[PDB]
Amino acid sequence: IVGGYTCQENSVPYQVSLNSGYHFCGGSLINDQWVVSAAHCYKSRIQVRLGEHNINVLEGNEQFVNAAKIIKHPNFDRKTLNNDIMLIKLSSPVKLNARVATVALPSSCAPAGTQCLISGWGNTLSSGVNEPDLLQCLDAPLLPQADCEASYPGKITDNMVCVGFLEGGKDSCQGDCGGPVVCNGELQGIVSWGYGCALPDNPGVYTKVCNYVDWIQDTIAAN
Ligand SMILES: [Ca+2]
């Protein structure tokens, strides 16, 4: 998260860190045994880290659970990032509490101008890399589809939405991939891609979760 603020400890209880020896992506807990992330975050084994604030210090509220099934959307395209969405079924259900909680799926697609919360332990710099120890948050609004298309001609499909600021300075970045964009209590976006990080005229692009509520429910049901 570039240009954000440190989240209060455990105030974004659905945020998880995907770890394979180091933090590499975010995700969001949607039920006691499943997390939603981005397909670009796929790995053969993943440990899901819930209840975290400092990812390098054990502060007392972590729950670490291995991923049992890792399911990328069947039409994910690694080159255009269309359908960048993946579900992770945990090897056991987590203990839900005030610091480890679910976030709701969208009941409708959100309109341009809705204010949202984006979070993660991704790079916090617009040039080079800095990996933060503490979870970072960013308040940012969904942008009109026409601004998103004009910023990345021919690359935005109907399963993508831009969120952020055309002036640059505040954005998500690598390592926040797969994490949440929550608006008014529902998960509307998943960190996906962007040109650079926090650059003017290059807002963050996110998977539009309101297009996959059926796929999510169905998958959960079959697995
Ligand atoms: Ca910790």
From Swiss-Prot:
Ranges where the Peptidase S1 domain occurs:
1-221
Q: What InterPro entries does the database record attribute to this sequence?
A: Peptidase_S1_PA (IPR009003), Peptidase_S1_PA_chymotrypsin (IPR043504), Peptidase_S1A (IPR001314), Serine_Proteases_S1 (IPR050127), Trypsin_dom (IPR001254), TRYPSIN_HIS (IPR018114), TRYPSIN_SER (IPR033116)
The gene name on file is Prss2
Report the enzyme's class at the first EC level. Answer: hydrolase
UniProt-recorded name of the protein = Anionic trypsin-2
Principal subcellular localization: secreted
Q: So what does this thing catalyse? A: Preferential cleavage: Arg-|-Xaa, Lys-|-Xaa
* Residues that, per the record, bind Ca(2+): 52, 54, 57, 62
List required co-factors.
Ca(2+)
GO CC terms: extracellular region; extracellular space
Q: Which organism is it from?
A: Rattus norvegicus
What Pfam families would the database entry show? Trypsin
Which GO terms fall under molecular function for this chain's record? calcium ion binding; serine-type endopeptidase activity
Q: What Enzyme Commission number(s) does the record list for this chain?
A: 3.4.21.4
